[PDB]
Design a protein around this ligand. Sequence first.
Ligand SMILES: *C(#N)C1([N]C(=O)[C]2[C][C][C][C][C]2C(=O)N2[C][C]N(C3=[C][C]=C(F)[C]=[C]3)[C][C]2)[C][C]1
Length: 215
Amino acid sequence: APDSVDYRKKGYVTPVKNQGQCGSCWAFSSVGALEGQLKKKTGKLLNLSPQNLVDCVSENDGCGGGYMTNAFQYVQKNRGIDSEDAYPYVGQEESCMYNPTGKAAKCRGYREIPEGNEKALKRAVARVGPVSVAIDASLTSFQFYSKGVYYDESCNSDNLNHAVLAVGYGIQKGNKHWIIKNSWGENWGNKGYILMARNKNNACGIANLASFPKM
Ligand SMILES: *C(#N)C1([N]C(=O)[C]2[C][C][C][C][C]2C(=O)N2[C][C]N(C3=[C][C]=C(F)[C]=[C]3)[C][C]2)[C][C]1
């Protein structure tokens, strides 16, 4: 595998979004991974609808939270997901209003990275594209991230409370990292991104709930 990978450089990653008050991080993570595969498969980058997921993935809890795998399984069984333009984000759960006419992507299933395996996660990012991951994002130190490679010994890998997108990996000044796209707006972090410690005993649980869609 390459020493570093950054899918932003290749137009596989849409702008950083802001989930607002809704607990829809799982939907932004899912859409990010789907977006990556859509660009890879069709050459077109577009915003897909996290609202479609919030409203229509019955296995998840809308703004109460959710699993990205349930989201990929929905898109698969539904035979599509709408674009953001066709099904805009409103930041509160509403009735499912999926419209096949606005369909922008399909899913043929998903793959999960073995729990805890950062080497497998690295391989997946290198081979497939951006990968949905879950982390402990609860710490104040995480809130206040500005630059460098984030590591906090207090991060709890058993408390996966937030879903984000691994769009690459690399090394900065000797510190191996994951390139993580968050959904807290471009004002948070470093332009909406965080570099998170890689190969540091699965810091923040980065490799405990990772998955990507098939297309
Ligand atoms: C974001 N924003 C939020 N976080 C999550 O959704 C995280 C993402 C990583 C996995 C765990 C998930 C989560 O908080 N939940 C899992 C699914 N839950 C659920 C509840 C009821 C139901 F019928 C089905 C699923 C809720 C908890 C912060 C919200």
